[PDB]
RNA sequence: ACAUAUUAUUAUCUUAUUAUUUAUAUAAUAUUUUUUAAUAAAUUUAUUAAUUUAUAUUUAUUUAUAUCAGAAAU
RNA sequence: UGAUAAGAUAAUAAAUAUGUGGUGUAAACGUGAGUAAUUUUAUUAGGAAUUAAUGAACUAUAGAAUAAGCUAAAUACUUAAUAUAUAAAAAGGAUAUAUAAUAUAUUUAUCUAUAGUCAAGCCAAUAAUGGUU
């Protein structure tokens, strides 16, 4: 029914497809063959009814996985619990270890922090499972300008709306993230800005090997207004959005740049007709930390 | 042969009837923590004090054990399949599948 | 009958060495 | 013991009084069924020595008759000896130390007769 | 006479199973092959479901031969 | 490691043989129904078709051990690569050390080839109870 219902049935759907046996597969989902199906009357596992014909499945979009992660509760386990599912599969099958791409990974991480309100466990399910990523050959995924950036402004949220101001953890824990990264392709140039953010934050100086100087190469999305395309180009850019505005809002240095600046009037005019991605994400974490 | 000397894992004799297991740690009162009589008492001592033939030998298997430094750990007898003896699996199996999936 | 073909042709082949023993002798 | 060809011991003599011929054997075949050859004999039970002769130092001997090329052609063949043949083997002199087992190892113990082979 | 039991045989009847040998499929699977939608990714390509195409491997039915066995006769 | 603990990773110590696998039951044991011999027995200094790209499983020696798929995974299975007219293969595990998963070393397995050992198939000659009512 709702979005999120209709996009999980989706995902579910084609996970049991590429989950079943290959034998079988012509005999289920085929319809030509739903009559050969009843005759061998193969038995469901779980000692359940024999298998029944199922509607033959198509390659799915990647906006079914964003439709489903906004649609979490505020405090719930569906998105956790889902890719502990999703990522238990075989990594010999390439559809589902090559469905996630760099954009889903910042639309969990962002979604878990400001809206689901489970950050830590769903950096913890990022990082346990990174090594099977890396055997299923998808190992673009954990990137700079989806993985590392995003983790580091959910960081600087969190040192803020919790106050952690140890110099040590801080450290460690952006060492283990860099350390994380597996395809270290700096574009934007908002990840040196992130991470020196964030050392002013925590009193401490950033030293990361290969993270060398970019300069900012911020996206302008054009004045022209589209339909359907300029709704993609915006939920395109909508990640560093979220990574201007928090640069700027949780330190004053950032505002030196004036880079940061342009993006934001050419993003916020681009539909300021509509809400804002940044401050919706903000009221959430607010309803989030009252409970 | 000599007397070994106690270690760490195996203190004393009641150390050294529970790591061997196979139920040795009824004999608890038969040695009385003695550490001589159990590096002592060959198998017609032990026969004499009602261990029988199977516990006896194996004690004396472990002792042996232990004086050449080799590991005393609990090793199990073995045990039919949960199916049964393979002269009697087929007819378990069939029994065993139209009992309990039908 | 394939079993009645090859009966009648053996019975048909020992008539002829029978016939054959009697103009042998 | 592994192979299909096997040295090893077949029992004879009467209950309580065991005796054994020392054997070439198929692996499948029985323990005492006819075997390819018999290398020799093997009494287990030690000649008594009388209390004189005891303190005298006289040790029990066992005696074992074996025929000692053929014994050495079926090794050279790759027959393979049982545990027990392979002790007696060791003791013979035809075997070395390359046939022990880490059970058996006698690394440290005191040589108090050195192998003698003689005429009689 | 004969009523029984057993066995064997067959120009006969029925026949499980199997082997071998026929014909057939809008049969299944894989690959090839002709196109056709849906979907996806990228900005043509891939996937799935169909159709055409041959190929190999099976499946169902079917032709013929032999065959446990039983029936009948001896 | 995961800013709160759900999980992940490695080390160590255990558990699991109701999951997938491997090896083992052509032997031994028991019996004497059938079997009078195109088949069974015994014998011979017997034979050829002038007996397989057969090793069954140990010995000696030499070489190799590759890529995918399928299963949850593999020393399972399938399809390929390369190896004595040429045909015909495989498999890793454990433990150390050094590296950034890989390499060596040790140990135990896998495959192929040559010979040996064990062990097979076939044939001849001779003999093997009673009744010709
Ligand atoms: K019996
Ligand atoms: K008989
Ligand atoms: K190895
Ligand atoms: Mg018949
Ligand atoms: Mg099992
Ligand atoms: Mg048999
Ligand atoms: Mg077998
Ligand atoms: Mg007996
Ligand atoms: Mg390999
Ligand atoms: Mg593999
Ligand atoms: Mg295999
Ligand atoms: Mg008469």
């Not at chain 1, 599912?85 to 075989?90: N, V």
């Not at chain 1, 283990?176 to 908002?190: D, E, I, Q, S, Y």
Request: glycine share 4%; net charge positive.
């Amino acid at each position: 029914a709702s979005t999120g219902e209709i996009a999980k049935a989706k995902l579910d759907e084609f996970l049991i497809y590429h989950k079943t046996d290959a034998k079988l597969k012509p005999f289920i989902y085929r319809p030509k063959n739903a009559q050969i199906l009843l005759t061998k009357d193969i038995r469901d596992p779980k000692t359940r009814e024999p298998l029944q014909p199922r509607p033959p499945v198509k390659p799915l979009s990647k906006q079914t996985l964003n439709d489903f992660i906004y649609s979490v509760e505020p405090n719930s386990t569906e998105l956790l619990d889902w890719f502990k599912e999703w990522t238990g599969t075989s990594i010999r099958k390439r559809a589902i270890w090559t469905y996630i791409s760099p954009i889903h990974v910042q639309k969990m991480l962002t979604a878990s922090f400001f809206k689901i309100g489970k950050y830590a466990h769903m950096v913890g399910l990022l990082y346990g499972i990174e090594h099977k990523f890396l055997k299923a050959q998808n190992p673009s995924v954990f990137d700079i300008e989806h993985f590392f950036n995003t983790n580091i402004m959910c960081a600087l949220h969190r040192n803020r709306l919790k106050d952690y101001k140890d110099a040590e953890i801080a450290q460690r824990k952006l060492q283990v993230a860099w350390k994380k990264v597996l395809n270290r392709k700096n574009n934007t140039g908002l990840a040196n800005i992130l991470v020196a953010t964030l050392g002013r934050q925590i009193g401490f100086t950033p030293e990361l090997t290969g993270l060398q100087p970019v300069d900012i190469s911020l996206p302008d999305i054009p004045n022209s207004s589209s339909g359907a395309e300029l709704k993609d180009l915006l939920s395109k850019y909508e990640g560093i959005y979220l990574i201007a505005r928090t640069l700027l809002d949780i330190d004053q240095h950032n505002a030196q740049y004036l880079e940061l600046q342009e993006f934001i009037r050419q993003y916020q005019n681009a539909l300021s007709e509509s809400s804002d991605p940044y401050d919706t994400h903000l009221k959430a974490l607010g309803l989030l930390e009252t409970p | 042969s000599t007397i070994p000397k106690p270690s760490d894992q195996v203190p004393d004799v009641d150390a050294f009837l529970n790591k061997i297991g196979r139920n040795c740690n009824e004999l608890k009162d038969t040695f009385e923590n003695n550490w001589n009589n159990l590096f002592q008492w060959d198998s017609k001592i032990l026969k004499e004090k009602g261990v029988n033939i199977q516990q006896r030998k194996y004690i004396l298997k472990q002792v042996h054990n232990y004086r050449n430094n080799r590991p005393i750990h609990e090793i199990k007898l073995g045990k039919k399949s949960f199916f049964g003896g393979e002269r009697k699996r087929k007819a378990f199996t069939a029994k065993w599948k139209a009992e309990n999936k039908q | 009958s394939a079993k009645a073909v090859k009966f009648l042709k053996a019975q048909r082949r020992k008539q002829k060495n029978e016939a054959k023993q009697a103009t042998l002798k | 013991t592994c192979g299909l060809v096997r040295i090893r011991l077949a029992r004879f003599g009467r209950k309580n009084s065991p005796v054994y011929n020392i054997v070439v054997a198929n692996s499948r075949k029985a323990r005492d069924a006819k075997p390819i050859e018999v290398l020799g004999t093997y009494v287990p039970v030690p000649s008594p020595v009388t209390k004189r002769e005891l303190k005298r130092g006289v040790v029990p001997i066992k005696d074992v008759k074996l025929d000692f090329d053929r014994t050495k052609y079926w090794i050279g063949v790759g027959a393979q000896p049982s545990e027990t043949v392979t002790k007696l083997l060791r003791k013979a002199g035809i075997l070395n130390d390359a046939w022990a087992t880490s059970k058996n190892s006698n690394v440290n113990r005191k040589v108090v007769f050195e192998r003698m082979e003689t005429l009689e």
